[PDB]
Amino acid sequence: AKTRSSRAGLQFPVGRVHRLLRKGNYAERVGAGAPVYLAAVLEYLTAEILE
DNA sequence: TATGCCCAGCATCGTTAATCGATGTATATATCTGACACGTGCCTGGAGACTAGGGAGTAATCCCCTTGGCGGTTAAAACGCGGGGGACA
């Protein structure tokens, strides 16, 4: 698969959330599966609420 | 001439049948709006690939801090008793 989201099996945007973690000054280095983890998390929450 | 008798004459009641119209019920067609999927076009904000560097991992040593044990006084917790004054109706 090309799309990252799909390599991690998800609907949430892997790379759009990565950049948002660099345009928010939150820190000097951005982690590699953080982004995903985080995307996926919210994903659940949304669901949880949206369910 | 007046009084019972013959011959029409429309409205009284009821019943039958045809007709215009309303109500109920399909049945295939022509709008209405609200789309969600696709292709149109374009931006680049992500992906992809490579590099370089310094953070963070780990490992090896140190030594400070935290836990422990103990026993003596000495205040504190514990108890009760009693009755007043605040809660509650």
Curated annotation (Swiss-Prot):
Organism phylogeny: Eukaryota, Metazoa, Chordata, Craniata, Vertebrata
Positions of post-translational N6-(2-hydroxyisobutyryl)lysine modification? K23
List the protein's name.
Histone H2A type 1
Indicate the family of this protein. Answer: Belongs to the histone H2A family.
Report where the covalent cross-link Glycyl lysine isopeptide (Lys-Gly) (interchain with G-Cter in ubiquitin) sits: K2
Its annotated function is as follows:
Core component of nucleosome. Nucleosomes wrap and compact DNA into chromatin, limiting DNA accessibility to the cellular machineries which require DNA as a template. Histones thereby play a central role in transcription regulation, DNA repair, DNA replication and chromosomal stability. DNA accessibility is regulated via a complex set of post-translational modifications of histones, also called histone code, and nucleosome remodeling.
Query: What's the subunit arrangement here?
Result: The nucleosome is a histone octamer containing two molecules each of H2A, H2B, H3 and H4 assembled in one H3-H4 heterotetramer and two H2A-H2B heterodimers. The octamer wraps approximately 147 bp of DNA.
Q: Where in the cell is it found?
A: Nucleus; Chromosome
Q: How is it modified after translation?
A: Following DNA double-strand breaks (DSBs), it is ubiquitinated through 'Lys-63' linkage of ubiquitin moieties, leading to the recruitment of repair proteins to sites of DNA damage. H2AK119Ub and ionizing radiation-induced 'Lys-63'-linked ubiquitination are distinct events.
User: Does the entry annotate any disulfide bonds, and if so which pairs?
Assistant: none
